[PDB]
Nucleic acid binder design. Structure first.
Ligand SMILES: C[C@@H]1C[C@@H]([C@H](O)CC2CC(=O)NC(=O)C2)C(=O)[C@@H](C)C1
Lengths: 204, 144, 125
RNA sequence: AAAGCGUGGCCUAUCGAUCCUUUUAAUCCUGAUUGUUUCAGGUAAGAGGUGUCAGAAAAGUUACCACAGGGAUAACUGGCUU
RNA sequence: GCCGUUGCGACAAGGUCGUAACGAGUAGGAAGGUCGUGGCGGUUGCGUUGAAGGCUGAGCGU
RNA sequence: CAACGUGAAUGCGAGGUCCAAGUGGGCCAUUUUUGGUAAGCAGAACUGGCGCUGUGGGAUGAACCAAACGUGGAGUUAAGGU
RNA sequence: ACCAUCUAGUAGCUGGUUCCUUCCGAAGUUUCCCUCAGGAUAGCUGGAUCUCAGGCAGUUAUAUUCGGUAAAGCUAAUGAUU
RNA sequence: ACGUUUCCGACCCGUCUUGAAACACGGAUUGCGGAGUGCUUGUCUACUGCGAGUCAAAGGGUGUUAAAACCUUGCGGCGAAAUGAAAGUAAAGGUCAGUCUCGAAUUGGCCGACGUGGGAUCUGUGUGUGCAGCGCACCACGGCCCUGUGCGUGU
RNA sequence: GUGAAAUCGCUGGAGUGGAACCGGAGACAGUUGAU
RNA sequence: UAGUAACGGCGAGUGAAACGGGAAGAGCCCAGCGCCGAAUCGAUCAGUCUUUGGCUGCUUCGAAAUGUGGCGUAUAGGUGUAAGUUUCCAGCAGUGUCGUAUGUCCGAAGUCCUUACGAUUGAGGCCAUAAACCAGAGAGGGUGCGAGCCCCGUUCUGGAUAGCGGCACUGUUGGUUCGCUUGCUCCUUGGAGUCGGGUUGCUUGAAAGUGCAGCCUAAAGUGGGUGAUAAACUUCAUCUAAGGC
């Protein structure tokens, strides 16, 4: 029997919730377990990076996020072709391939092409058989510097830059920004009705 | 803090502060928000007007990202300018503010602008915001 | 902003503003005059601006040493009734001519907006 | 003619929430892959009714009976009244 | 006369003191408790020359 | 803006906001009063009580008369009495 | 029927509800409810306090008002009636 | 002082109840156990830190008195903007002086969070008290601005 | 191990007319203190 | 995200997902079309080896053309051609390098003096300014309650030893490799009582049908599905169901 000014109750506890209870007392244990797994993987696959395959640069889908970038599943076939890497070579060299992703814009393609080029520049390739090096294979004093990389490979930078101060131009000042926005909205809203009127006029 | 609850002071008194006549008895009025229309009608109408009934268009699977549009007032714009940019903006140069990078999509014209003209880049502007910026001597630039 | 407004008034330019309320920084304030203030706590931005503008910040014991009887003082405080909790105080939301804020889980067309809030549903108060 | 009077009946009774349906209103808003027209849904005002009238959808029997209580409540005594 | 509450006040004090009036109480609400019990982080000590527990005289506290 | 200055008695500091308990069976009495033949019956009005309350008196009593309560002392009384 | 489990089934109903002092201290009334052994609501009550330092009062005075009961009248209207 | 004897007082507790010592119910006696809790979600209140910000999640890095502590966030929650069913729109005026097609016009300066009354305090000045000035919080009465809607025009 | 209360037996004292217990105030017995 | 969109005698109540930040990350195989066309496979026999299983065959039977194997699957694929580039598996032995909740063995210092006790581990003293001694061991337990120093133990990111594993390199046995990528050329490219529709029942937040199933109906080939309000006519966007690891 609620009394006085209250916020109406909303608790979802009318089910036999005591049968389905999950506690987090093992959070530090899980943290330690994952650290140990990472260490074991690093030992297993040394000197290769612990993170694993190299991932691509992506733009977040929706307009709420499209001003940001993040890591992707892999590199598109167009991107690999532009960077001059075969899909098989990427697979054996440790580059993620996104067989589903396709490029529709030169800027997006070029960003990942540059990422691939930089990774190839930073790559160190050990001889297949230590005794006999081959072509494309890294040099001995380069191999002496090889060390395991921890964290993301070629991590992205999320720093925000401020545009340089400039001068306000009269062409800029003369524009009617609000009227322009309202005009665009009106044009989009009334496109179809205008087409119908034009068709009716043509028939007449 | 069990040592500070009423239970510590109610020991020795038979009714535990719930009365001898009324008594503390389970659910004497019903469970939850029951009877909001019959016997809790006065309380419901007094403290939660508008509760019963339905009003407005119903949107199957609302798309909240579409309507997401954080706003910044014109009075708050200068505070977004870093001190280094303010130092650089000298001799007729106005600082440039990228509201979309700062996390604001629309600019609303509440308050007053500083003496320094500003260039503001946002997806949307209000008419008053545009008027105030241009009057202060800056410019408004639309971005996608 | 309130501190500056108090100090800019004719005759208050040299008096010390005394407040037991925390002095916060106002981003909407563009020009900050020279302020001499005694307070319990001053935020980082407000303190930086006050000191940069040539002002002075002292504690309550320093104020006691300066003006033991409170001479040349301007007593100020923040708005007491400006609280979200105070928004909910007053006549109940469901009584005539009441602008009290209700306790609602969320905001939207589906949260206490139908019956007793518009004439199209029973009545409106 | 005018000053004036007129939002129903000279005054004190003669009546109805939510949801749903239905009608009227805008050269209205929405259907979120782009549009047109149907269709559907909305904003505003009415009607369809709850007479237990602040508004559940509702026939009996038990002497075969049961449970929680009640001296807040009857049948026998006692008490007041006659 | 003493105890305490309330109001006021003095004093360099989470305290002491002074002063005037006051003191019923079920349901109920608050405050104080160096009233009592069992743990933990600390601190102070006692103990086979006798701890806890148990029985019971001299006192203390409304 | 200019002038005028507290315009019956007595008593006394005043006002504001928030959070919340218990209660939502009452009963008695002077006077008024409806139903009833009446009722220690049923139903109302004002006020005071008991409930929540002890104390002196009415031999005894929830309500009657006196008077309300820290713990003690001296003196004097109320109603009532010798 | 019996056994185990759902199941510590629900109960507006009955019973119980465990230390001491100090301060304040009620209600059985209004409205709505398939409401009448129950709730919500206002009232009564406690606590936190905050803003101030003369306008208030379960009392009178002055001034002005409202009423249709007691009394009075039916040789005044209505209704009885010698 | 739970011994004895005197004088005064002295009905059995708990409970429901208008009313209990009741011919109302429970209580033969003693020991031990025995009942407002946990959590989720709100709200108010008190305290603490910071403050237009605050808290940061999962996670990562480190840590061997390693389930602790310490470091670490383009992003997330709450707050900073409301209003409408929605499309959408979205919170700066005060004063002075002008032109005028004298109107539901327009222009320019100064000031910039509005006006008035009451306001602890502060300041000045007379004689515990008076007058004047700047006025916090708050209260009262208004004024403007945003959005929805009715009427209603035009430029 | 300890070894409580209820209940019970013994020895000594004291009371003992249809309850017993209890509060206030003395007395007795008793206990205890006196540079 | 979020107690949000949505469902609900729109009452009580119920109630997700995408985007975003992270943990981990690995890709692939068929049918069909096309080419080779039995090039494939099981038992049995005989050799051979490192034999609770493997390798060879004019062994003999059988499965398989109602089609086993090779290439090949949406990122396609294939032919030819020009460039570049070209091994991979499994076992055995050795060499070290590293882990073992794997066994066994190994360890620093007082039972010193006085005292207390039924019994000490209790109290005091043990050169030295800083002192009984050890301490990388002052965790725990036992011993006549009390103990780092009496014992087992504890610390030595402990040692020695035997065994199990994983690694890296050498040797060696068996099997296997006409491939692989990019450019050009020509050819080629796919799941049916299934999808879809009607109706019925259950189910969901899914609202003119979210998922599932019964009955009737029952496809097509730039076809089919989806784009959350049903239908036609239109812009497109995005995947490729009815097979598998
Ligand atoms: C206007 C009146 C009422 C209406 C309808 O039955 C009322 C609703 C009310 C409700 O909240 N839930 C229901 O299931 C019924 C109707 O068809 C007719 C009787 C006419």
């Amino acid at each position: 029997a609620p009394r006085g000014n209250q916020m109406l109750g909303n608790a979802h506890f009318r089910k036999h919730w005591h049968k389905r209870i999950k506690t987090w007392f093992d959070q530090p244990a899980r943290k330690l377990r994952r650290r140990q797994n990472r260490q074991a993987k690093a030992v297993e696959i040394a000197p290769r990076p612990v993170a694993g395959l190299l991932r691509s640069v992506v733009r977040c889908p929706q307009k709420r996020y499209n001003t940001k970038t993040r890591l992707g599943r892999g590199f598109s076939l167009q991107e690999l072709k532009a960077a001059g890497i075969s899909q098989a070579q990427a697979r054996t060299i440790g580059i993620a391939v996104d067989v589903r992703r396709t490029n529709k814009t030169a800027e997006g393609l070029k960003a990942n092409a540059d990422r691939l080029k930089e990774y190839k520049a930073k790559l160190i390739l050990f001889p297949k058989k230590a005794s006999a090096p081959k072509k494309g294979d890294s040099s001995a004093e380069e191999l002496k510097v090889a060390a395991q990389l921890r964290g993301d490979v070629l991590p992205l930078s999320h720093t925000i830059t401020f545009d340089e101060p400039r001068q306000v131009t009269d062409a800029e000042r003369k524009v009617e920004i609000f009227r322009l926005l309202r005009k665009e909205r009106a044009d989009k809203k009334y496109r179809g009705k205008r087409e119908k009127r034009a068709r009716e006029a043509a028939e007449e | 803090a069990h040592a500070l609850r009423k239970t510590r002071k109610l020991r020795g008194h038979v009714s535990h502060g719930h009365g001898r006549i009324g008594k503390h008895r389970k659910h004497p009025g019903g469970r939850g928000n029951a009877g909001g229309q019959h016997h809790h009608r006065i309380n419901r109408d007094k403290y939660h007007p508008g509760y019963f009934g339905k009003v407005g268009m119903r949107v199957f699977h609302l798309n909240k990202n579409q309507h997401y549009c954080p706003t910044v007032n014109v009075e708050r714009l200068w505070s977004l300018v870093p001190q280094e940019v303010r130092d650089k903006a000298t001799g007729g140069k106005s600082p440039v503010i990228d509201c979309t990078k700062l996390g604001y999509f629309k600019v609303l014209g509440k308050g007053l602008l500083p003496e320094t003209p500003l260039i503001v880049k946002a997806r949307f502007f209000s008419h008053e915001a545009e008027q105030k910026i241009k009057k202060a001597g800056g410019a408004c630039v639309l971005v996608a | 902003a309130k501190l500056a407004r108090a100090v800019q008034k004719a005759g208050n330019e040299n008096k010390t503003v005394v407040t037991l309320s925390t002095v916060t920084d106002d981003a909407r304030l563009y020009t900050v005059p020279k302020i001499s203030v005694a307070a319990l706590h001053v935020t980082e931005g407000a303190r930086a601006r006050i000191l940069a503008a040539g002002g002075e910040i002292i504690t309550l014991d320093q104020l006691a040493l300066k003006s033991p009887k409170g001479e040349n003082t301007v007593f100020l405080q923040g708005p007491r009734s400006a609280r979200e909790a105070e928004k909910h105080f007053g006549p109940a939301p469901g009584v005539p001519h009441s602008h009290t804020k209700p306790y609602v889980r969320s905001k939207g067309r589906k949260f206490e907006r139908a019956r007793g809030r518009r004439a199209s549903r029973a009545y409106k108060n």
